[PDB]
Amino acid sequence: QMSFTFASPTQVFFNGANVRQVDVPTLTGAFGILAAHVPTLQVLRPGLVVVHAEDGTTSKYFVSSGSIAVNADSSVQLLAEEAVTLDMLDLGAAKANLEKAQAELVGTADEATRAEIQIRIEANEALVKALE
Amino acid sequence: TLKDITRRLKSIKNIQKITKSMKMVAAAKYARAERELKPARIYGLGSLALYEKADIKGPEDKKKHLLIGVSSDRGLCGAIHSSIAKQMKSEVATLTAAGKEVMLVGIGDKIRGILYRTHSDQFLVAFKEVGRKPPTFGDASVIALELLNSGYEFDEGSIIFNKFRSVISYKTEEKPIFSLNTVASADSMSIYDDIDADVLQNYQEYNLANIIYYSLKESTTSEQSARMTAMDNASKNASEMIDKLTLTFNRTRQAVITKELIEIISGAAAL
Amino acid sequence: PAPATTFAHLDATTVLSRAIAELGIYPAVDPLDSTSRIMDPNIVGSEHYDVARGVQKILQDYKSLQDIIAILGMDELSEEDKLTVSRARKIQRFLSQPFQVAEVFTGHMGKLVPLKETIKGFQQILAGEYDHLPEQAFYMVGPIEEAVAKADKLAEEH
Amino acid sequence: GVGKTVLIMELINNVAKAHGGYSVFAGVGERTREGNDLYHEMIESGVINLKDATSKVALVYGQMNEPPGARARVALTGLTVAEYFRDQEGQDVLLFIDNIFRFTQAGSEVSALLGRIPSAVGYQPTLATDMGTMQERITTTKKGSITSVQAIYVPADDLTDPAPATTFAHLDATTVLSRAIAELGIYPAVDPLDSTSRIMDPNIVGSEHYDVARGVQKILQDYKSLQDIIAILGMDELSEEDKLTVSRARKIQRFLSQPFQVAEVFTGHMGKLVPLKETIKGFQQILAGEYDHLPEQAFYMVGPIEEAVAKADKLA
């Protein structure tokens, strides 16, 4: 019953395929979408996504910042600017990135640029815990 | 004259060579273009899936308007820029006639050039260096940023582009773009939850970026094809002219030989 | 040598062309090769003279554009260039005329356009008063009234 | 580049075998080096026999270092030694003229020497009658026939030049030996699309022959079309008929290849001359779509379709 469309701008992982349950890390919380979910539209934040296939096995991706929409017709569109697998990413570079990021954070002092460094930090940390 | 025909023949010959090379490279680009278009098409339509499943009727009351036109910076593609131009200017005429002010963004130097002396007074911003490289998401993020940092919060909007139908045909399409106000006011959106000004704002901004990306991809493709077929036509017509001018060249050189021979003979006969 | 020598003996040469007659335009007079000695604003008046010079200017512009028009197509011309080509083709067609002695060929009845109708029709086509009519509405007509009538017939029937 | 001496020698051989016709080769205005080369190639390939009385061709040569009178009458000498065979033996003689343009230009030089006023371009005033008084003797009388194969040079690549334009009035057929076809590896490299014949109409070769040849021609044209559309680099098959005809036409344009007997010492392949009806029938089959299961390379350097299917079996 689930019409899932996990789709990066230059790739497509699902298109109308039937899966049993997905998880999404929306700005306002990480939750799970199943069939006949109440209609929702949200924007994402960096972190994992785990598609549970009808055959039970879970395909794990890592999205950067997209948008999810669960419609009345059980259609679930998940458009993520950067969709990845979990072997495609390393651990040391993510760690070093977050370290230098917070270093510059307490270094940087302007409000807007502060928010930018903080967003880089949150992305890198969602990634660092999604690592291992 | 023999030398005039020789010069004109050489000119048309190198022109035909140029057009054949342009056709070749344009087809080469169109390969990757239509390779990238399909997943991006799935993507950019999954974005609009909600405004379809929600039937956002659109503001019937509001005054201002924003009109985007997708083209490239390179002419010599066909009637692409001309089509976008005519639809954009007709639409602006009919909206300003109906009492609705409109300001216009032009993606692509060609559309800005061909519509700047027409509607400069009604013009927001333009973008260039699109068309040389295969458009990506970064393009859309940038155009959307400078559409929002514009401060011009439009009542509504329409993007106009050349929907790729296939290698021979393209259709000038006009996609709608709603504002926060009426997407909030739309009673249909009462079925969706957890929504307020903030999350609908984020979603509208990101969907603006998505639709601009998908339109750029729809227009990059549907331009390499038009360019390929146009250069095919150019090379064919150039070779037709080459054949006819070669006939005339042979005719003229035979006539020249005859005339010089008759000169020599009449000169020899006077002795 | 025979035509070239004859040219100097005439006051008003009218030069027919095969390339024009292959377009179906009769009489096949070449507009850019027919001259006259009374084509002088102090004899035919400034109205007639200016209309004639403008017709010839637009036809010359069309001729000079023809090469890249047939190489690249019209889709690459400037919008002003598309306008000059449109008016030039219209003037081409309006220059043709059914002949009373050519009913056997044209099927139409011969028209005898007096001078002021000619001047006025061409002045109007130049000014742009017929940018909406199809070009085939001017082929083989009398005065411009018949051109507008033929355009109306084409628009209603087709 | 393309093998033309081989085609000439094979025509000599075939016409001597199929019919009983001897051949004459006129060497109008020919390079002495090329004449010696041809003499030795025809000795090697068995058409000329230096030790027996089984030679199938008589040679007449007027070289390039000979006065215009010689080069102008040498074609008539060859024509006479062929007319003997025709009118006194009832044979179907084959007369080759290794260049007819040099015949025309030798007549031009002769008339220039005699002080006559030249005509269009410089040719003799008697160009048409000089060509006619020669070509009118190459006919089919009630006693026999003389069929003439005349190599043609087109000066300045103008097919409207008076010499080729006065020669084309007498031509009945035309074969074009393209180097492009030879680079594809087809022998004889006869361009199947640029070769013409005036007896192709159904009133002369029958509707069966006419329709088989017309179909082959149309399929080859459509294959070159689909080739320039395959140049898209998007070789797909959104049409079943397109690739069907692509392989049909490739099998055809390889079936228009043949091992010649005269090239039996250079290549182990045996020379297979094929009758007319068998050619018509084989191309009829390939056009009807039958030999699809057969691979492509079993239609290469083969005789009739029997040899084709025998080879196809023998591929394994």
Do A65 and A117 lie in one domain? The reply is: no
Determine, for residues B53 and A72 on separate chains, whether the beta-carbon distance falls below 8 Å.
Answer: yes
How far apart are alpha carbons B144 and B152 in whole angstroms?
Answer: 12
Do A123 and A69 lie in one domain? The reply is: no
Sequence-distant (6+) residues with CB within 8 A of A104 are A117
How far apart are alpha carbons D231 and D228 in whole angstroms?
Answer: 5
Q: Output the CA–CA distances (angstroms, integers) from residue C65 to B236, C62, C81, C82, in the order listed.
A: 19, 5, 8, 10
Look at strands D145-150 and D92-97 and give their pairing.
Answer: parallel
How far apart are alpha carbons B193 and D190 in whole angstroms?
Answer: 77
Give the count of Cβ contacts less than 8 A between chain B and D: 27
CA distance B115 to chain C (A): 11
Number of domains in chain A: 2
Nearest residue to D175 (alpha-carbon basis) of D201, D155, D148: D148
Look at strands D23-30 and D57-63 and give their pairing.
Answer: parallel
Name subunits touching A (3+ CB pairs < 8 A). Answer: B
CATH architecture of D207-314: Orthogonal Bundle (1.10)
Determine, for residues C75 and B238 on separate chains, whether the beta-carbon distance falls below 8 Å.
Answer: no
Total residue count of chain B as it appears in this document: 271
Q: Is D316 exposed, middle or buried (0-12, 13-18, 19+ CB in 10 A)?
A: exposed
Look at strands D23-30 and D92-97 and give their pairing.
Answer: parallel
Instruction: Give contacts of C 56-85 with B, CB under 8 A.
Output: 70-73, 75-76, 79
Q: Is A102 exposed, middle or buried (0-12, 13-18, 19+ CB in 10 A)?
A: middle
DSSP symbols for B137-173: HHHHHHHHHHHHTT----SEEEEEEEEEEETTEEEEE
Do A43 and A79 lie in one domain? The reply is: yes
Do A77 and A58 lie in one domain? The reply is: yes
SS3 string, D266-294, reads CCCCCCCCCCHHHHHHHHHHHHHCCCCCC
3-state secondary structure of B1: coil
Task: Tell me if D289 is assigned to a ligand binding site.
Answer: no
Token pair in block for residue B30: 């169109």
Nearest residue to B92 (alpha-carbon basis) of B80, B105, B101, B83: B101
Nearest residue to B50 (alpha-carbon basis) of B155, B198, B170, B200: B200
Q: Omega before D188 cis (within 30°)?
A: yes
Do A97 and A129 lie in one domain? The reply is: yes
Q: Is residue D223 within 8 Å of residue D244, measured between CB atoms?
A: no
- Assign residue C99 the CATH number of its domain: 1.10.1140.10
Q: Is residue A33 within 8 Å of residue A24, measured between CB atoms?
A: yes
Q: Is residue B159 within 8 Å of residue B174, measured between CB atoms?
A: yes
Is there a catalytic annotation at residue D4?
Answer: yes
Which of D10, D17, D31, D89 is catalytic? The answer is D31
Q: Is residue B161 within 8 Å of residue B70, measured between CB atoms?
A: yes
Q: D25 - beta bridge partners?
A: D59, D96
Q: D40 - beta bridge partners?
A: none
CA distance B226 to chain D (A): 14
Do A83 and A97 lie in one domain? The reply is: no
Give the residue ranges of DSSP H helices in B159-223. Answer: 180-185, 197-220
Q: Is residue D155 within 8 Å of residue D163, measured between CB atoms?
A: yes
Look at strands A66-70 and A75-80 and give their pairing.
Answer: antiparallel
Question: Which chain B residues are Cβ-neighbours of D121 within 8 angstroms?
Answer: 254, 257-258, 261
DSSP symbols for A73-108: TSEEEEEESSEE-SSS--SHHHHHHHHHHHHHHHH-
Determine, for residues B230 and C75 on separate chains, whether the beta-carbon distance falls below 8 Å.
Answer: yes
Token pair in block for residue B135: 């458009």
For chain B, which residues make up each domain, given as ranges? 1-24+231-271, 25-230
DSSP symbols for C52-85: HHHHHHHHHHHHHHHHHHHHH-GGGS-HHHHHHH
Candidate from B39, B137, B191 with C-beta closest to A12: B39
Q: Which amino acid is at B186?
A: A
Name subunits touching B (3+ CB pairs < 8 A). Answer: A, C, D
Phi, psi of D196 (to 5 degrees): -120, 160
Q: Is C44 exposed, middle or buried (0-12, 13-18, 19+ CB in 10 A)?
A: middle
How far apart are alpha carbons B253 and B245 in whole angstroms?
Answer: 12
Instruction: Give contacts of A 48-107 with B, CB under 8 A.
Output: 66-67, 69, 71-73, 75, 77, 79, 81
A13 C-beta neighbours (distance < 10 Å), count: 19
How far apart are alpha carbons A51 and A7 in whole angstroms?
Answer: 13
D122 touches chain B (CB under 8 A): yes
DSSP symbols for C89-154: HHHHHHH----GGGHHHH-SPP----HHHHHHHHHHHHHTTTTTS-GGGSTT-SSHHHHHHHHHHH
Do A29 and A84 lie in one domain? The reply is: yes
Is there a catalytic annotation at residue D142?
Answer: no
Do A7 and A17 lie in one domain? The reply is: yes
3-state secondary structure of B238: helix
Name subunits touching D (3+ CB pairs < 8 A). Answer: B
Q: Is D212 exposed, middle or buried (0-12, 13-18, 19+ CB in 10 A)?
A: buried
Do A82 and A96 lie in one domain? The reply is: no
Do A97 and A78 lie in one domain? The reply is: no
Q: A23 - beta bridge partners?
A: A32
The helix (run of H) or strand (run of E) holding residue B92 is: helix B80-97
For chain D, which residues make up each domain, given as ranges? 1-197, 207-314
- The residue of chain D nearest to residue B225, with distances taken between CA atoms, is D232
- List b or e across D162-173, with b for residues whose CB sees 16 or more CB atoms inside 10 angstroms: bbbebbeeebee
Nearest residue to A47 (alpha-carbon basis) of A71, A31, A70: A31
Q: Is residue B242 within 8 Å of residue B16, measured between CB atoms?
A: yes
Q: Output the CA–CA distances (angstroms, integers) from residue D10 to A85, D99, D270, in the order listed.
A: 69, 18, 13
Do A79 and A96 lie in one domain? The reply is: no
Cα-to-chain-centroid distance, residue D141? 23
Q: Is residue A104 within 8 Å of residue A33, measured between CB atoms?
A: no
Instruction: Report the CATH fold assignment for D1-197.
Output: Rossmann fold (3.40.50)
Structural domain for A18, as ranges: 1-89
Q: Which amino acid is at B25?
A: V
- The residue of chain B nearest to residue C76, with distances taken between CA atoms, is B76
Q: Is residue B232 within 8 Å of residue B23, measured between CB atoms?
A: yes
CA distance B237 to chain C (A): 6
Q: Is residue C77 within 8 Å of residue C61, measured between CB atoms?
A: no
Determine, for residues C79 and B15 on separate chains, whether the beta-carbon distance falls below 8 Å.
Answer: no
Token pair in block for residue D124: 């003799």
DSSP state of B60: S
Do A83 and A37 lie in one domain? The reply is: yes
Q: Is residue B68 within 8 Å of residue B139, measured between CB atoms?
A: no
Q: Is residue D261 within 8 Å of residue D273, measured between CB atoms?
A: yes
Question: Which chain B residues are Cβ-neighbours of A76 within 8 angstroms?
Answer: none
DSSP symbols for chain D: ----HHHHHHHHHHHHHHS---EEEEEEEE-HHHHHHHHHHHHHTTSS-SSSS---EEEEEEETTS-HHHHHHHHHHHHHHHHHHHHHH--EEEEEES-SHHHHHHHHHHHHHTTPPP-GGG--TTHHHHHHHHHTTSS--SS-EEEEEE----GGG-TTSHHHHHHTTT--EE--B-HHHHHTT-SS-B-TTT-EETT-SHHHHHHHHHHHHHHHHHHHHHHHHHHHHHTTS----S-HHHHHHHHHHHHHHHHS----GGGGSSSSS------HHHHHHHHHHHHHT-TTSS-SGGGSS-SSHHHHHHHHHHT-
Nearest residue to B216 (alpha-carbon basis) of B132, B148, B149: B132
How far apart are alpha carbons D194 and D174 in whole angstroms?
Answer: 8
Structural domain for C104, as ranges: 46-153
Q: Which amino acid is at D173?
A: A
How far apart are alpha carbons D54 and D86 in whole angstroms?
Answer: 18
